Every structure is written in C-alpha cells, then in structure tokens.
Short mmCIF file of C-alpha atoms in Angstrom, two decimals:
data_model
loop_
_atom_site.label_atom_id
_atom_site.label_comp_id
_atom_site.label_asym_id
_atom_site.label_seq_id
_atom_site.Cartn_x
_atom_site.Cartn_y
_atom_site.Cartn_z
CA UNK A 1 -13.57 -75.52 -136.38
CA UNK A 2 -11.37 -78.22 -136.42
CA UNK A 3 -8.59 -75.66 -137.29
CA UNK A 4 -9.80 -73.32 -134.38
CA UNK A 5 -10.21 -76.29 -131.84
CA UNK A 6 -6.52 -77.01 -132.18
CA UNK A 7 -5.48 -73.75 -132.05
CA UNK A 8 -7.40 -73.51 -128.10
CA UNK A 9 -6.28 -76.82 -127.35
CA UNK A 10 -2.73 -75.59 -127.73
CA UNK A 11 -3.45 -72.70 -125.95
CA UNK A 12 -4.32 -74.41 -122.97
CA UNK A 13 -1.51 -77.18 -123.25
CA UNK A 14 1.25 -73.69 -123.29
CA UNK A 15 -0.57 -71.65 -120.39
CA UNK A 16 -0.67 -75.01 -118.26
CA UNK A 17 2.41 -76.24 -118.98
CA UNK A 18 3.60 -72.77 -117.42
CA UNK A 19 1.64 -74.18 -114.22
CA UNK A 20 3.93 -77.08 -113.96
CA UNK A 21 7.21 -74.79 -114.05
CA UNK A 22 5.61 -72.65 -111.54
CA UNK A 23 4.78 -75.20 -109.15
CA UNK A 24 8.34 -77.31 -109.56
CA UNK A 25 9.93 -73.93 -108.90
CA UNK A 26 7.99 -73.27 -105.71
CA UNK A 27 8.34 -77.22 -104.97
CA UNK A 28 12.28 -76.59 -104.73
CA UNK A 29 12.46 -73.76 -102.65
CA UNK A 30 10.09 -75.08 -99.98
CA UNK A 31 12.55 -77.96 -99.96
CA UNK A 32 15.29 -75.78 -98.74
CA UNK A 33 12.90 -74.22 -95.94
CA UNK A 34 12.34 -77.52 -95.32
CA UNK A 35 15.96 -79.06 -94.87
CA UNK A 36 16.25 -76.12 -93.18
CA UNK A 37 13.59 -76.58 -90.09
CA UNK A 38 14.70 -80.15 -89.72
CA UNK A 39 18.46 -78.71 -89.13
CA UNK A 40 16.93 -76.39 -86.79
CA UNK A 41 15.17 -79.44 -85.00
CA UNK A 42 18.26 -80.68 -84.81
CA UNK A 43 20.20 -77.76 -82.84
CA UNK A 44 17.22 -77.30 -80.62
CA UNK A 45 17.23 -80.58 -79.08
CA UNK A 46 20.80 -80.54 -78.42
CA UNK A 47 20.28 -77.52 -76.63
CA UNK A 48 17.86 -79.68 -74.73
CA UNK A 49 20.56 -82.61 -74.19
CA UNK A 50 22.74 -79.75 -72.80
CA UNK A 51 20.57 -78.20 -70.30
CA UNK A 52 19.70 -81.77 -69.78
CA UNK A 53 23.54 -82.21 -68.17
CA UNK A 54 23.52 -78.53 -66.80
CA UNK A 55 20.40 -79.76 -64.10
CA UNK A 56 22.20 -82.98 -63.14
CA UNK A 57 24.83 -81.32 -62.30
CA UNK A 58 23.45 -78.79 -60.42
CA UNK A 59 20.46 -81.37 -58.44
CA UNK A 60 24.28 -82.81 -57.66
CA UNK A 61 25.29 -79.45 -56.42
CA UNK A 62 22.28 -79.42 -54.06
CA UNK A 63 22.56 -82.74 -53.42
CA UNK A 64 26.05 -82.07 -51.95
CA UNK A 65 24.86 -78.66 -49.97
CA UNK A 66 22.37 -81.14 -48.51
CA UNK A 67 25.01 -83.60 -46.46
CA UNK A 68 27.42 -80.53 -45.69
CA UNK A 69 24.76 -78.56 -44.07
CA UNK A 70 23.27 -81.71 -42.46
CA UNK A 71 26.62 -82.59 -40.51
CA UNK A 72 26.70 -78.79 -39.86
CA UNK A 73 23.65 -78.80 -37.85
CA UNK A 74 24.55 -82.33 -36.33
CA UNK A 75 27.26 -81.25 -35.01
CA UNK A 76 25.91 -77.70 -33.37
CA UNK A 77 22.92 -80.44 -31.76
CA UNK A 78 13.14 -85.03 -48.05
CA UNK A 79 12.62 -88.13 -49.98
CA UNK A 80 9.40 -86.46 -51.42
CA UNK A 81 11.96 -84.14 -53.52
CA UNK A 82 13.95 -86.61 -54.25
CA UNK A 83 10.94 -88.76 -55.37
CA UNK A 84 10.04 -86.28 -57.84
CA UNK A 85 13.41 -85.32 -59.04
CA UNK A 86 14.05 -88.89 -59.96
CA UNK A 87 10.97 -89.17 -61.87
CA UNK A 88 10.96 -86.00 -63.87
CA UNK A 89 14.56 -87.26 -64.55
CA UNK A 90 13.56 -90.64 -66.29
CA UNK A 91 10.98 -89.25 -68.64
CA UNK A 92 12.82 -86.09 -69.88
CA UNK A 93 15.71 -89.03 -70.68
CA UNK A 94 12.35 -90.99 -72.67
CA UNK A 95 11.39 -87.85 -74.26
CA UNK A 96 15.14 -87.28 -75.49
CA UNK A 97 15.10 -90.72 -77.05
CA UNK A 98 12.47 -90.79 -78.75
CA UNK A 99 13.25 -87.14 -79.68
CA UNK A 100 16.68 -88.44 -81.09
CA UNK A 101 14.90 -91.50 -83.06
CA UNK A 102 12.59 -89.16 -84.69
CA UNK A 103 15.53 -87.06 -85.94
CA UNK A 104 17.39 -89.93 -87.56
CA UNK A 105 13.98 -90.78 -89.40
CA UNK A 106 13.43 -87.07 -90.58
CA UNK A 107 17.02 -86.71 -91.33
CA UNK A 108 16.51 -90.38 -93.35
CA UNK A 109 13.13 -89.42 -95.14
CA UNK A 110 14.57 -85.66 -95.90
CA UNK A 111 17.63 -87.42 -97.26
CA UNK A 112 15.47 -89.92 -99.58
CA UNK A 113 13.84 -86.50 -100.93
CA UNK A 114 16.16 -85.20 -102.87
CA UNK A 115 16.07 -88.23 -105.79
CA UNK B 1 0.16 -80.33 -140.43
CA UNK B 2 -3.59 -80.84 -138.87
CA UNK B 3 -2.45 -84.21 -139.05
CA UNK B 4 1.30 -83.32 -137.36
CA UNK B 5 0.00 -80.48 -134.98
CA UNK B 6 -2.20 -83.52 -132.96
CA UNK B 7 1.17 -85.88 -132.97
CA UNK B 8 2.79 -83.01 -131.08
CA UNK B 9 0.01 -81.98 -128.82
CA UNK B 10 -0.57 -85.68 -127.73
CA UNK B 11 3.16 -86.36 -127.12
CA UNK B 12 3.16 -82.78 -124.83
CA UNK B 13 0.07 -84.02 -123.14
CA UNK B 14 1.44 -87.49 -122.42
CA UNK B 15 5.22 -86.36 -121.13
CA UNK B 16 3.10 -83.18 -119.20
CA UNK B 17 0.92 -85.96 -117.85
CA UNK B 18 3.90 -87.43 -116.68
CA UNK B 19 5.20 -84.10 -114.69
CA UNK B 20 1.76 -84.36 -112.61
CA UNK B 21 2.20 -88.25 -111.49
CA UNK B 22 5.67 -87.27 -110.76
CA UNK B 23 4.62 -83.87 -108.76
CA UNK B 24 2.02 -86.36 -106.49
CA UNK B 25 4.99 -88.56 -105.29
CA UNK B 26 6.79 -86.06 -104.78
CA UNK B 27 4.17 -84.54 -102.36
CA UNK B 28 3.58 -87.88 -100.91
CA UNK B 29 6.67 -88.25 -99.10
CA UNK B 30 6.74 -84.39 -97.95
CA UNK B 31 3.26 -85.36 -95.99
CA UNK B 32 5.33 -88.24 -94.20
CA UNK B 33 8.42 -86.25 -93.55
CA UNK B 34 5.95 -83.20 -92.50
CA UNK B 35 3.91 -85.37 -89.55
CA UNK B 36 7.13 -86.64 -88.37
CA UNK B 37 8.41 -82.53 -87.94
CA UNK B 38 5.10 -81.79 -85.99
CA UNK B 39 5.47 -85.22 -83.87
CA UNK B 40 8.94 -84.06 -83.50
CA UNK B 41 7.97 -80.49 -81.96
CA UNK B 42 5.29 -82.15 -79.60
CA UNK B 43 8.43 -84.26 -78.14
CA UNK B 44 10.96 -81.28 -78.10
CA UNK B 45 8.05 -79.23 -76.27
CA UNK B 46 7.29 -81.77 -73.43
CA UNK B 47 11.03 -82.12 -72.81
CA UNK B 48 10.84 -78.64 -71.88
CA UNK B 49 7.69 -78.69 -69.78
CA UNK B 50 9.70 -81.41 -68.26
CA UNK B 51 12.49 -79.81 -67.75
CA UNK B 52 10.37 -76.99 -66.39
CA UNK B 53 9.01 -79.09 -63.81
CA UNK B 54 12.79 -80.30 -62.88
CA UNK B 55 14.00 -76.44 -62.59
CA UNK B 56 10.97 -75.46 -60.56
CA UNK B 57 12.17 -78.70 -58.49
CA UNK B 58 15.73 -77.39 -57.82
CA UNK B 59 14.42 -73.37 -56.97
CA UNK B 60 12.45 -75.05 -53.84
CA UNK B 61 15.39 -77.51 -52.87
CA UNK B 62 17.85 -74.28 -53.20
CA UNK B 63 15.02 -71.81 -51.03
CA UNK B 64 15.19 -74.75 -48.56
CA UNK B 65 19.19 -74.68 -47.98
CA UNK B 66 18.82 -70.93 -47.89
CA UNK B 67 16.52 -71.64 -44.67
CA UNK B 68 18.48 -74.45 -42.85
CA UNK B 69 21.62 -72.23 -43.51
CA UNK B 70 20.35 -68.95 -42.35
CA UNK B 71 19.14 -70.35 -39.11
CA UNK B 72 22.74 -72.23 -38.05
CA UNK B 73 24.72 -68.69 -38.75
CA UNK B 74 22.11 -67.06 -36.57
CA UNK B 75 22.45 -70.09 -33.88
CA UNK B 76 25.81 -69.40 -33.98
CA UNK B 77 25.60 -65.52 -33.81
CA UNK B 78 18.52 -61.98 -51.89
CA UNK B 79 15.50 -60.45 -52.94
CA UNK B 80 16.79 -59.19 -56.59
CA UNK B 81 17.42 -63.36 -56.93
CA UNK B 82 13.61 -63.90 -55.80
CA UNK B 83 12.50 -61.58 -58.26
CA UNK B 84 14.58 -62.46 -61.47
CA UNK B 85 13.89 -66.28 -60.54
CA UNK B 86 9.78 -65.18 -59.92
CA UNK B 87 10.02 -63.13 -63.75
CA UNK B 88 11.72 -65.43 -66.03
CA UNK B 89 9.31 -68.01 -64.60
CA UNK B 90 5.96 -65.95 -65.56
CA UNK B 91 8.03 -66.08 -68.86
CA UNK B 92 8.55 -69.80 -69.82
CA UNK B 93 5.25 -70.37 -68.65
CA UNK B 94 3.64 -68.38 -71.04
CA UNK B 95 5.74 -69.16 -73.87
CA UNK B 96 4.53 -72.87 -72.66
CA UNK B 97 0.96 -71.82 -72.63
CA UNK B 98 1.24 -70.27 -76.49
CA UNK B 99 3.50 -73.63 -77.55
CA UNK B 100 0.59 -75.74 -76.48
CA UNK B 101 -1.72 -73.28 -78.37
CA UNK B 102 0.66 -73.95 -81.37
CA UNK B 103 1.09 -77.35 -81.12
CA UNK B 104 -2.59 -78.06 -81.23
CA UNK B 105 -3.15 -75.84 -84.65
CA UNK B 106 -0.30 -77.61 -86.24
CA UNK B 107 -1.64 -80.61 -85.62
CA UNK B 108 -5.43 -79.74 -86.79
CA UNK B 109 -4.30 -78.49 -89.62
CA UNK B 110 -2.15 -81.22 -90.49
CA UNK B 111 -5.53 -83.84 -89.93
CA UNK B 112 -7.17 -81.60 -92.23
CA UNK B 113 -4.20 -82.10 -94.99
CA UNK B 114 -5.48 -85.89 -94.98
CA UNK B 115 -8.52 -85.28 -97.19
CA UNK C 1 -10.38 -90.27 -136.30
CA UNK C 2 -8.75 -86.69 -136.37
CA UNK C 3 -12.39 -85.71 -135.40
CA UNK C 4 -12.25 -88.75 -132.39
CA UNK C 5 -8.65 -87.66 -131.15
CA UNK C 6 -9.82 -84.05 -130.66
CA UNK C 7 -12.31 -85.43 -128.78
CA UNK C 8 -9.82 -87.78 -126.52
CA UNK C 9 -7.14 -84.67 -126.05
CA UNK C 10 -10.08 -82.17 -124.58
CA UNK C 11 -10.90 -84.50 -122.07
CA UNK C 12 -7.51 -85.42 -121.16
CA UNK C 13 -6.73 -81.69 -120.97
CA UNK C 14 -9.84 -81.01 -118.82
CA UNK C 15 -9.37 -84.18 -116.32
CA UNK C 16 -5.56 -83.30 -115.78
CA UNK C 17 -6.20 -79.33 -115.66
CA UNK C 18 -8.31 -80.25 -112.85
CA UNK C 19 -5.50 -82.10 -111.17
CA UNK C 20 -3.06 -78.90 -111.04
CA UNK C 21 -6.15 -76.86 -109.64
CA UNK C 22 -6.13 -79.61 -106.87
CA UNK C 23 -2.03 -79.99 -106.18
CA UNK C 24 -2.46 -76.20 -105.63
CA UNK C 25 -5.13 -76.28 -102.87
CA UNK C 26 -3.42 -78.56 -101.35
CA UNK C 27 -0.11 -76.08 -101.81
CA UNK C 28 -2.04 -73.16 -100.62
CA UNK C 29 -3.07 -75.34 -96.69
CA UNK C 30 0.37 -76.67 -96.54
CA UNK C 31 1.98 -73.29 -96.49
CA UNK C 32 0.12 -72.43 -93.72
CA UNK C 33 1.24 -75.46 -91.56
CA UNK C 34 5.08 -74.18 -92.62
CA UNK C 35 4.42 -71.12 -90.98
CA UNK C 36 3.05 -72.34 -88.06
CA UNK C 37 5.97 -74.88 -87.53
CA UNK C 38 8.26 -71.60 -88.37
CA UNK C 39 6.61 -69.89 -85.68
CA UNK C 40 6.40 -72.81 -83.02
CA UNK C 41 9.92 -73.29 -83.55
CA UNK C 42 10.63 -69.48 -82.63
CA UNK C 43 8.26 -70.07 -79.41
CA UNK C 44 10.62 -73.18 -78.54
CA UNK C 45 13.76 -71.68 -78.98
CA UNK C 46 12.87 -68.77 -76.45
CA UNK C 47 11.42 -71.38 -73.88
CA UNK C 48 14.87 -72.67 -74.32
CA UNK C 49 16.43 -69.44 -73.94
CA UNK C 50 14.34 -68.43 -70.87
CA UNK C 51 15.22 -71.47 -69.23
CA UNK C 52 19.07 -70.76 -69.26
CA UNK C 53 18.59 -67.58 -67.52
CA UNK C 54 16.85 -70.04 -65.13
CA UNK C 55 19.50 -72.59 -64.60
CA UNK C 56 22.24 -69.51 -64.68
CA UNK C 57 20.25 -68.35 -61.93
CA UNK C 58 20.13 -71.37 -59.73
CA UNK C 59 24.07 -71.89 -60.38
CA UNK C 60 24.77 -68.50 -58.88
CA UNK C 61 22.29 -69.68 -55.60
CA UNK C 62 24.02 -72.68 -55.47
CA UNK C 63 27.18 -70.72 -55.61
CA UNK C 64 26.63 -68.62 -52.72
CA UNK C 65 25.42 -71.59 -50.30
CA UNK C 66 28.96 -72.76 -51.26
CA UNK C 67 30.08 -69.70 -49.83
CA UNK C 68 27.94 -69.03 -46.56
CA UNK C 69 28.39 -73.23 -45.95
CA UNK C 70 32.14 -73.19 -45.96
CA UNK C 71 32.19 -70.05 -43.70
CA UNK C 72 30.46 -71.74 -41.09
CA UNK C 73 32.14 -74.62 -41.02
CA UNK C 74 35.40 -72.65 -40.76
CA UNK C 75 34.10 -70.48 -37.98
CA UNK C 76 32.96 -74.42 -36.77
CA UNK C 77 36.15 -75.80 -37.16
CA UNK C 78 34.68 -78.63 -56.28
CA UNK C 79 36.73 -77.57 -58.88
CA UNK C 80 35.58 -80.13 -61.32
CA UNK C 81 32.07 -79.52 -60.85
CA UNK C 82 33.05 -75.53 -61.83
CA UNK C 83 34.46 -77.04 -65.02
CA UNK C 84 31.43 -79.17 -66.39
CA UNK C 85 29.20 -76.40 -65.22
CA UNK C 86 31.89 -73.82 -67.12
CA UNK C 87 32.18 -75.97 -70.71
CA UNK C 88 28.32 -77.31 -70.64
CA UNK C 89 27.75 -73.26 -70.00
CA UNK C 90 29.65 -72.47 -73.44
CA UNK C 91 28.04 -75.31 -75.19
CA UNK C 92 24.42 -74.06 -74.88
CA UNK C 93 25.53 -70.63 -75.73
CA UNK C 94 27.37 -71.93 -79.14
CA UNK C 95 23.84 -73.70 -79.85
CA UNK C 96 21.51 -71.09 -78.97
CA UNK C 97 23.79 -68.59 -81.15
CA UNK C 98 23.14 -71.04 -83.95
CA UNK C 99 19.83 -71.51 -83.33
CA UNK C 100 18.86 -68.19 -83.40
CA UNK C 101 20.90 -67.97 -86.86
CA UNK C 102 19.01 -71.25 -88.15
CA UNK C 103 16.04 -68.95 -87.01
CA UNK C 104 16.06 -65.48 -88.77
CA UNK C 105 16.86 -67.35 -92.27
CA UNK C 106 14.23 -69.54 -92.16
CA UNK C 107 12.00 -66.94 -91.43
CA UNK C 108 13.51 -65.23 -94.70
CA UNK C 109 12.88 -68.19 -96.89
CA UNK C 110 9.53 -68.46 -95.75
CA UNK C 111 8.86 -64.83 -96.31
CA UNK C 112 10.67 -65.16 -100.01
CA UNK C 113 8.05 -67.79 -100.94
CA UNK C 114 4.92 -65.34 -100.40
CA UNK C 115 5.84 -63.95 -104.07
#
C-alpha cells in the first residue's frame, strides 16, 4: 500500500495542478474585462464633464433671454431659480472631483496589477 | 524510486503551494480595485441625478420665457417640444429608478464578498 | 520516515485542496458582481444618452426665444455661444460613440468567460 498510496497521491497532485492552470487562465481574462470597465468609467464621466459645460452654457443662454426680455417689457410699461441652479451647480462640480480622484486611484491600483 | 517518487511529489507540492499564496494576493488587490469601481459608479450615478435635477431646472426657466414672451407679442398685436421634453423625461427617470436598484445589489453583494 | 512523509504529503494535499475549493467560491460570487457592474454601466450610459436628447432639446427652445425675442425688439425698435454649444455638441457624440463601443465588447468578454 505504500506503492498504491503514492500512486493516488500523484493522482491528486496532476488533476489539481490542472485546477491551478484553469483558474490562472480565467484569472487573466477577467483582467482584461476588467481594464476594460475601468476604461469605460473613464469615457463615461467625461461624457459627464461635457454635458457638464453643455448646461452652463445654456443656464447662460437663459440667463441672457432673461435681461433681453426684461428691458422688452420695461420698455412697453426669480432668485428662487437661481438659488437652486447655483446649488445643483456646486455639487455636480463635488461629485466630478471626487469622480476624477477615484479614477486616478483605479487607473493607479489597475496599473499596479499587472506585476 | 519509492524513495525518488516522494522527492518529486514534495518539491510539486511545495512550488504548487506556492501558485495558491500567489493566486490569494493576486485576488487581494482585485477586491480593492473592485470597491473602488462600485464607489466609482455610485459617484458617476449621482452626477447624473444631479444633472437631472439641473435640466429639469432649465425646462421650467425656458416654459417661463415662453410665457413672458408670448404675452408682449400679443400686447403688441410647441406642443411636439412639450411632448418629446415630457417622454425622454419618463425615460431618464426610470433608467434612474433601475440604476439605484443596481447600485444597491452591487453593493450587497460586494459586503457579502468580505467573508 | 517514508511511512511519516506519506503521512505529511496527504495532509498537505488535503489542507491546500481545500484552499482551491475556496478561491473558487469566491470566483463563482465575484462573477456575479462583474455582471452587475457590466449591466449598471449599460443603465448609465443610456441615462447619459437620454439626457442629450434633453439638453438638444432645450438648445433648440432656447433657440427659438432667440428668434421670437429679436423680432420684437425689431418691430420695438451670439455667435460664440453657437460655437461652444456646436464643438461641446461633437464632443459628447465622439464619447458616447465610444462608449457604446467600450460597451458591446465588454459585454462579449463577459459572455466569453461563461465557458
């Protein structure tokens, strides 16, 4: 049995050191699915930074509408919204910070990865 | 070669054994850079609800000029828009609604990694 | 001692066979918390799309205010904003094309790792 014993134990050390490959295989592709949703990340909030600039310039755009109208009416004779617009407005520009911190970090921890 | 066979199976074991430890590192960093993708998403996502707030900000202060405007040309003297503006809002705030749903999953299933 | 070291390598074999049995448990739950960052990231980028339509929509009102305002002050009685509103307007297109490239092959790598 001694003879036998070695012959399982080497059985088990071939069909788990199949495991191993298996799992280092799956290990690398997951890392380019990976890469791959941090890239994404990446795009999306720059989509967000641009659409960021497209409503300033069009609360600008009312802004101006606003006066030109005004004088309009003056011369044939609020604040809540602007409240609100200026609030919304400082914490989407938080939100984008921080968003743009947490994608050097990711970028930086994704990088380390691949040693 | 009973003798030989267990020098071999004890130097696969040990350099196997070594795979593993290296496999668990491995997997310990992927956890970080995994929480910082879901923080990452939570951020990008209340950006938009942000920015959703901001557009729904700039619909009212455009519906207003409409008013102030139509009444000085009639001193003096749309609908497709309304309903395009009325659809795509139903829209983002569903895709909202099912982002939130998302985001809370994620992040469940991401505490239940931890163990 | 051959007897002894048989004894050693069966436990080592056991304890660390255990250990792959774990690191794929743990492979099995973190799939699922791919897909769902996958899928959020779908739901975010069509937020994002929705919410152009939006802000196209609201140039085009602001657009026509220009109009109907500058006809009654003539009856009374820019160009740079047009640009940034023009390039920023290209921009978020050229991203959203991306994104929605970035999107479909992740979505393909994700379904390649179910074999």
């Amino acid at each position: 049995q001694i003879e036998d014993k070695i012959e399982e134990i080497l059985s088990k050390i071939y069909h788990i050191e199949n495991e191993i490959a298996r799992i280092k295989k799956l290990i690398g592709e997951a890392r380019q699915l990976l890469s791959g949703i941090v890239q994404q990340q990446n795009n999306l909030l720059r989509a967000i930074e641009a659409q960021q600039h497209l409503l300033q310039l069009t609360v600008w755009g009312i802004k101006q509408l606003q006066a030109r109208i005004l004088a309009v009416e003056r011369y044939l004779k609020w604040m809540e919204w602007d409240r609100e617009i200026n609030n919304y407005t400082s914490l989407i520009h938080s939100l984008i910070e921080e968003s743009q911190n947490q994608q050097e970090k990711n970028e930086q921890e994704l990088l380390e990865l691949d040693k």
